[PDB]
Amino acid sequence: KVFERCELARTLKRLGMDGYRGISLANWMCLAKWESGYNTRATNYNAGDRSTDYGIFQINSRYWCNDGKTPGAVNACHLSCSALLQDNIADAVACAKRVVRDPQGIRAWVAWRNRCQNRDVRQYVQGCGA
Secondary structure (H helix, E strand, O other), X not given: OEOOHHHHHHHHHHOOOOOEOOEOHHHXXXXXXXXXXXXXXXXXXXXXXXXXXXXOOOEEOOOOOEXXXXXXOOOOOXXXXXXXXXXXXXXXXXXXXXXXXXXXXXXXXXXXXXXXXXXXXXXXOOOOOO
16 A cells, blocks of 8 residues: 555554654654655565565565565564565554664664655654644
């Protein structure tokens, strides 16, 4: 499913993402925007290391979810990567929460550093009533 901006903003707030481990809602919005375009079925195979990014937050199979074909991988979220491709984003959110519980926090996603860090991200949540 492709979420509309404010729809996603309100959904994430309801799932408790606002301020989770110090990360504001607008930052999560910026991340979802640049990672998937707010699309839950987005997948990206990385030919370089044989891992695949899944879902709205493009979570990587090498550490977070199990897809069986990624070599020397772990499954920290204890989820099949299939779970990160559902229209209902509850599992993707629970896994995103697990990712930021690691020392790097939101920095675990390089796209966040490139397109969100130190920028005015208010625009991603303006007018959404979230």
